[PDB]
Design a protein around this ligand. Sequence first.
Ligand code: SF4
Ligand code: SF4
Ligand code: SF4
Ligand code: FCO
Ligand code: FE2
Ligand code: NI
Ligand code: H2S
Lengths: 277, 481
Amino acid sequence: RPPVFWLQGQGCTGCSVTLLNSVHPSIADVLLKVISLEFHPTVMAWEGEHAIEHMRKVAEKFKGKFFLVIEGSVPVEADGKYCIIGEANHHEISMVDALKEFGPNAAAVLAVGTCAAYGGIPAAEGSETGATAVSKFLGDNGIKTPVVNIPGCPPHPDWIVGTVVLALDAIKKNGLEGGLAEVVKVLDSDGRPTPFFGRNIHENCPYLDKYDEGVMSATFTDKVGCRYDLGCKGPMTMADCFERKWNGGVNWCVQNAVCIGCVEPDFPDGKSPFYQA
Amino acid sequence: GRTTIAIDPVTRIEGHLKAEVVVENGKVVDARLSGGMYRGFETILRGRDPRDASQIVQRICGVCPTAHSTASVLALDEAFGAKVPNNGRITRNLIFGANYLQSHILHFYHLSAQDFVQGPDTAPFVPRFPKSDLRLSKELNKAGVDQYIEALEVRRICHEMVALFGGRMPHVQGQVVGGATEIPTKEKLVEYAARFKKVRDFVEQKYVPVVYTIGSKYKDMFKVGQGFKAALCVGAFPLDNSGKKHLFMPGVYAKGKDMPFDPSKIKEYVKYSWFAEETTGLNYKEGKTIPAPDKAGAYSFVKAPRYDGLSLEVGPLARMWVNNPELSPVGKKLLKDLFGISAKKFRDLGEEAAFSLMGRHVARAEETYYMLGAIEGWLKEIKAGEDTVVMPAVPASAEGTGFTEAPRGSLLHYVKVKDSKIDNYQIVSASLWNCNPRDDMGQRGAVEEALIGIPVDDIQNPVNVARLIRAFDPXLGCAVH
Ligand code: SF4
Ligand code: SF4
Ligand code: SF4
Ligand code: FCO
Ligand SMILES: [Fe+2]
Ligand code: NI
Ligand SMILES: [S]
């Protein structure tokens, strides 16, 4: 069970919650059989500088080998003061400083959720914190550690667990260096693993026949027509929700309402307004 | 003499919180809480199609997004002049109510329970303080761990319930201005009821009994954490179509007195908050959000909301105290058997015990039981096939306010529309009421005040500081937005 540190920057804890919803394997099996979650602010036993120091001791012991998950974006304005994640013996630690510290020493950084992968809502028009995506922040700071984007707002638990397991399997069959090279190979141009983000929603939508006939629902509760006029962003969105669906298969955005393009690099501004074409 | 203890991050809460306390003679004698992360949703929302708000605002918090969804669509309903159809009102209740179950269960077991229960000898359950004051027998501790594990599946099932008519969770697609986007079918209502029964069984047989039971091993925790003993509820879960009856009725409780809630008495101060000085003392309808992260003297990204000058708390304790419902049958029995207390309604716990560290955990479990009853009713009231939405046009100029109760406490959203776009949007959230810093006049926030008197007999293992904090179920993502 490889060590994982889970840092929250400008996140909403929704990427953590969506992980909790994993069906197969259960989050219990993930925590007890798949990874060792050594630091996570929402669920770990310890607290404060003690928790920070624990993460540091494990990071030193597993230098080059631990996985770093980032939930939320990284704000660079005001010397990093828009996100303070901890304090060690009177020294404040901003998200900017934590990423500069741990980022160089991770085996890989997993940018979970659209905020971490692409900037997301904290980076959107009208914001002023300098909310920055993980790969851009690391690159701006000369940190070359591989980054894997698992976007979505939130991602499906299967995208997160699936990418972790994919990477862990690749490392067990090729060693660390070969494993990562294998992971990089299955990423698209936006750093997303193709097993989950390689297909377009619209091309595989059960309502595509209605779209082609030009039969559009005029109210949300009309489930017969295509949802395009109501603002559906399926045509511009790369994810497998149409098949996997959500929360144990009980529903998904297009059946219930509309797709809002949550996995895309331009989310939200490029997918807005959500409720018109 | 005095020792200052700083805890950053405070863990097993949502979001970024630093607590600083001063301890003297084994007691907290002063406290400061710092919200250390800011995103600025109130400025980000400006200029957008107002219909977008009900999606954007949920990203304030992925633990309580249905709360912001609800507050937002209620504000939009008023601004757009939309009349939510009867069946849409009930559907919204079923979507939102299901997450109350998820959130209280998550809080007690996955955030709070480690305060009293020793987990298995593996991350993230270790390491922890060498002297964690964990008092349970082998048997009761094991019940806590087994239930923690079972509660992971139960909270997941709660989100399946939310998603049935909400689309997915976190971040529902199913609530919009004008109602709910998906009419409940007979088949899906069977699916919701089937999961609901499993959740009900866990709440009745495990959750409520374990809270009183653990509580009976920690009776000292009913004697501390009183704070101001002042409470706010703004109403939630409409039970009809005229905005009168709600599951939780509005009210303020302060200095032994009940009084009506008047939203015009809300002001937000910013002296000790990282916002421009000129923006202090604003009611939400004139609210302004100008960050000032270098301002001297300030120590939080949380504004300081005050109600007619009063520092109040919110959440299950506030709602259950204000509304004073009958206690659960299990609660009544265990209060008798374990505590020697005869109680019928929530206030029979007494003010001192109810407004306490453990009292807040009890209130949350009692409210979870209370919500079961409401959801049972909505399941009988809903009519399969009846329309749940209207499609209103976007107004050119309008304003609206949505009031509801998030699982953590009172929530309102205010929206002003000009040129068919968001001109201003102001959020006054639950943990804003709880986890705020001093106001301009030096009055502490609710949790700040509740920290005073908290025992710290061992400064090397100062466990009760964050124990107190966690009883409020803090959510700093919500507090700051
Ligand atoms: S990607 Fe979405 S769900 Fe995840 S932290 Fe960002 S706002 Fe929350
Ligand atoms: S626009 Fe949306 S609802 Fe219509 S066919 Fe495409 S993905 Fe499906
Ligand atoms: S259907 Fe669209 S909005 Fe919904 S989760 Fe998939 S990509 Fe995101
Ligand atoms: N519950 C919840 Fe979130 C907070 N505090 C809101 O509103
Ligand atoms: Fe606000
Ligand atoms: Ni919240
Ligand atoms: S919520």
